[PDB]
Amino acid sequence: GTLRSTVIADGVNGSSEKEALVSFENSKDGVDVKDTINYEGLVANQNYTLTGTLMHVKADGSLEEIATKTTNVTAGENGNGTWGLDFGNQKLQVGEKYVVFENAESVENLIDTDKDYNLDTKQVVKHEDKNDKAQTLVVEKP
Ligand SMILES: [Ca+2]
Ligand SMILES: [Ca+2]
């Protein structure tokens, strides 16, 4: 299973090649932060707990949690599709970089890990890549 993500910051999307650039003007009333999560290789019609974390990237490369959103979601027809997380309006600061991390954990056991054809382990998929520009926003200087 995989998760991929796109941050949408004041209506500006991240991409693999370019962080979402949020103008200082846009940031003055806070930054509306949403995230769309493309999942593949999950189990069709099964419930997952989806956790998104908006991380502030500090000068030393360490991360601190700004916002967290947890939803209860269901995998599609064929175990693939898109979920969303709306973090709402966030008070993000000029010159700073923020990145969205995502985790999905099946509510039930979905994996047999000991060849007895009984399910014993949850499926866990994560995307925790602070270098993924598609998940990254930067607040620009005035
Ligand atoms: Ca704004
Ligand atoms: Ca088993």
Residue numbers in the entry: 446 to 587
What's the paper's own text on this?
Two buried and protonated acids, D480 and E547, act like the oxyanion site of a serine protease, polarizing the carbonyl bond of Q580 side chain to increase its electrophilic potential and reactivity, and potentially stabilizing a high‐energy tetrahedral intermediate.
The replacement of the nucleophile threonine with a serine produces a crosslink species that is then hydrolysable at basic pH, and we have further proposed that this reaction follows the second half of a serine protease mechanism, whereby a water molecule attacks and breaks the ester bond of the acyl‐intermediate (Young et al. 2017). The T450S protein, similarly to T450C, closely resembles the wild type with an RMSD comparison of 0.66 Å across all Cα atoms. An intramolecular ester bond linking S450 and Q580 is unambiguously present. The pocket occupied by the T450 methyl group in the wild type or thiol in the T450C mutant is partly occupied by the buried acid E547, which, having rotated outwards from the wild‐type localization, no longer forms a proton shuttle with D480 and the ester bond carbonyl. Instead, E547 hydrogen bonds to an adjacent backbone carbonyl of V110 and stacks directly above the ester bond ether oxygen, making a close contact (E547 Oε1–S450 Oγ, 3.2 Å). The T450S structure instead shows the E547 side chain rotated out of the protein interior and stacking directly above the ester bond ether's oxygen (Ser‐450 Oγ). With respect to the mechanism of hydrolysis, as shown in the T450S crystal structure and reiterated by metadynamics simulations, the presence of the smaller serine relative to threonine considerably increases the likelihood of E547 directing its carboxyl group outward and close to the ether oxygen of the ester bond. T → S substitution enhances the ability of E547 to swing towards the ester bond to facilitate hydrolysis.
